[PDB]
From a paper:
We solved the atomic structures of each of the peptides in complex with H-2Kd, demonstrating the peptide residues that interact with the MHC binding groove and identifying the solvent-exposed residues that are most likely to contact the TCR. We show that insulin reactivity by a CD8+ T-cell clone, known to induce type 1 diabetes, is characterized by weak T-cell antigen receptor binding to a relatively unstable peptide-MHC. H-2Kd is unusual compared with the binding motif for most other mouse alleles (that have an anchor at position 5 and the C terminus) in that it anchors at positions 2 and the C terminus, reminiscent of most human peptide-MHC binding motifs.
G9V was designed to improve MHC stability and has been shown to activate G9C8-like T-cells more strongly than the native G9G peptide, although the molecular basis for this increased potency has not been fully resolved. H-2Kd·G9G crystallized in space group P1, and H-2Kd·G9V crystallized in two distinct space groups, P1 and P1 21 1 (only the P1 data set is shown here in detail), which showed identical features (data not shown). The G9G and G9V structures featured unambiguous density around the peptides, which were presented in an extended conformation, primarily anchored at peptide residues 2 and 9, with Cys-5 acting as a secondary anchor in the center of the peptide and residues 6–8 extending away from the groove. Consistent with our previous findings, the lack of an optimal anchor at the C terminus of the G9GF and G9G peptides had a large negative effect on their stability compared with G9V, which showed a melting temperature over 20 °C higher than G9G and G9GF. G9G made 17 vdWs and 4 HBs, and G9V made 21 vdWs and 4 HBs, both through peptide residue 9. Although G9G only lost four vdW contacts with anchor residue Gly-9 compared with G9V (anchor residue Val-9), there were knock-on effects at the N terminus of the peptide. The G9C8 TCR bound to the non-native H-2Kd·G9V with a comparatively strong affinity (KD = 13.6 μm). Importantly, the G9C8 T-cell did not express an inherently weak binding TCR, because peptide substitution of Gly to Val at position 9 resulted in anti-viral-like affinity.
Numbering used by the authors:
A (entry chain A): 0 to 276
B (entry chain C): 1 to 9
C (entry chain B): 0 to 99
Amino acid sequence: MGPHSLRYFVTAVSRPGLGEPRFIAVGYVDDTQFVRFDSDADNPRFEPRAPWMEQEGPEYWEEQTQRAKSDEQWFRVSLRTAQRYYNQSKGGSHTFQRMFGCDVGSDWRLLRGYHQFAYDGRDYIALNEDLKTWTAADTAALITRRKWEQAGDAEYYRAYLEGECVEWLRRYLELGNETLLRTDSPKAHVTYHPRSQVDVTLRCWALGFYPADITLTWQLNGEDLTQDMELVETRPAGDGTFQKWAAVVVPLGKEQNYTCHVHHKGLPEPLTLRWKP
Amino acid sequence: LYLVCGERG
Amino acid sequence: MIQRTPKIQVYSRHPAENGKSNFLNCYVSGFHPSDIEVDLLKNGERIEKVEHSDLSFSKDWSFYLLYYTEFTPTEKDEYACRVNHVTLSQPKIVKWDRDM
């Protein structure tokens, strides 16, 4: 139902001295993580991180594991390589990241495909949205960019982002359908917190919802007032569901005038909430 | 499905 | 290079009731590089068997982790999350406040 994403976040962090680089691959579908590879692991393999993946057979794991190993090596080289291009000391730790995968719409039309890299916290080179041309962040990345045009890799990542990524996202949402296609409506309520003779804080809580997308508004007598409102970032509960709140400071004794409004995919219409002595 | 990197940096 | 400092939230999985079993979370996001020390404290002492999720990152390359433990909140027991990171000169303590 609606748009979906299959995303992989890969991180390689070099340790000159201290042993080989650390390399981590973690996979998500939408807001939900489903797989991991981690190089520091006693027995380093590609693993499930969502019970429904234990459905997929042993050659998948073995094949994913192996594919994850080539990249550990690729990232080993690409780090020494990058260390030279930037003319850095041999004894500094540094970070390569890579994100890739596909966003499709409800009709499985590829909305956008990704294959992008960062180095030490900044964009390094990215495959553009056309899936044919590359964007380099700086002249160092020009060196890399030229190899990849020359080797023609754009077409190898494109066919994947237009093909496998998408046909496999379809398959994973099939496997974990009773989690990934679910909706958990927010459990929501309004708390009152005195402060001074002049103010009190009202806080509007949305708990235990899925997917992560939510919008909490505060209104005064039926008019909007999002200006003058504290709100925390959406945060994970730890059980696969999310939490968010929005608070407003209001004058003592005017509490009943305010309405928090909660909007989620799970709710048949928005919730209006009002604090009640 | 994990797609490996082709040519190196 | 661009380093980014951690953004921290401390909170319970469920709304707190004294004596009722729960989970304490410290969500640490918006930081780069990935290396980071996080600890849950109970009256200032480190709690054992703290767990964290797999190291991951957001559209802007910044990392995030959730640390968590089983706990039973209590009237007098102070809980806090203590984070250190290359971009800080001293660790940050954020105390858990059941109302946030």
